[PDB]
């Protein structure tokens, strides 16, 4: 199951 | 960063003439990911070749498996031809049944 | 034994036209179970193992949404990094990301990871404590200060120690019949007369799972590395792996040499000898 949020750099 | 691919050419199963098999070209250790890989039969490009989804190792270098079904014979010669920005000319690695 | 779940992400910019190529792969131990390729027609997260097809449409809809959101993050990161490194818009560049978790043989959390690279070099990575960041250069240091202020590590830690472990367990149960089976190496030795006075012994390990394996040569019961060759472990294409190790020996002395195979699927190491 993937991360729900992937914050940008 | 530029890393030249390692190449292994091999069958999925111990090769026997006249018995269907899979011809593999495993390319690894390379960077960047843009790469051209063809499987050859007696010097000609084999058309129905599939490959794995791009993935990479802990040092960030990429690896791909290219493969096609084939039936080895005594006379047919098989090889993998790889081109990559690190290569001045395409590298051709012949299939050796013992490797 | 122990187990892991890992996601790998690659995004390659395409300056001549269009958006970056994005490829995501998901892997339980050495088994790929999902993929997304921005060049593919589905535009969906796709199954790559039978046991993940037990998941219903809410799973595929949500993972598809999330992997597309991952791809957009990588797209804007490529733009951010281009500016951080004052690079031109004419060149192609690459971001790579891996994250996931390990659990022990008791399925308890062991270790979480989240690492990021730009053009094949470390950029930023979560430390083993899952609280601080390793920034390789001053560009990554700018990201580190931004992610510290926003407490990104706390969010990733909640996932790596929580969500990740729980779903790895669920996958291990749904795929028990393969994910929890070890395939011991099928071993044999071949003999090749190089010249009149030397022969090559090649010790083969075939059709094994998982990929981790150790092949060693001994001469008279002592480890030998001189005049040996070990190939990288390689995929068979059917989910198992292959490896071989070879040693060059004086012709007629083959019997002094033994090949030793260690693998999780073996109750004890195997020893092979040419007779």
Residue numbers in the entry:
A (entry chain C): 1 to 9
B (entry chain B): 2 to 100
C (entry chain A): 2 to 276
Sentences from the study reporting this entry:
The typical 8–14mer peptide presented on MHC class I comprises only around 2–3% of the amino acids in the pMHC complex and is spatially confined within the adjacent α-helices of the MHC groove, thus posing major challenges for engineering peptide-specific single-chain antibody variable fragment (scFv) binders. One peptide each from CHRNA3, GFRA2, HMX1, IGFBPL1, PHOX2B and TH were selected for preclinical development.
To select those peptides with the highest potential as putative immunotherapeutic targets, we prioritized peptides on the basis of pMHC binding affinity, HLA allele frequency, degree of differential expression of parent genes, relative abundance on MHC as compared to other peptides, recurrence across multiple neuroblastoma tumours and relevance to neuroblastoma biology based on the published literature. The presence of these peptides in tumours was validated by performing liquid chromatography–mass spectrometry (LC–MS/MS) on synthetic peptides, yielding complete concordance across b and y ions.
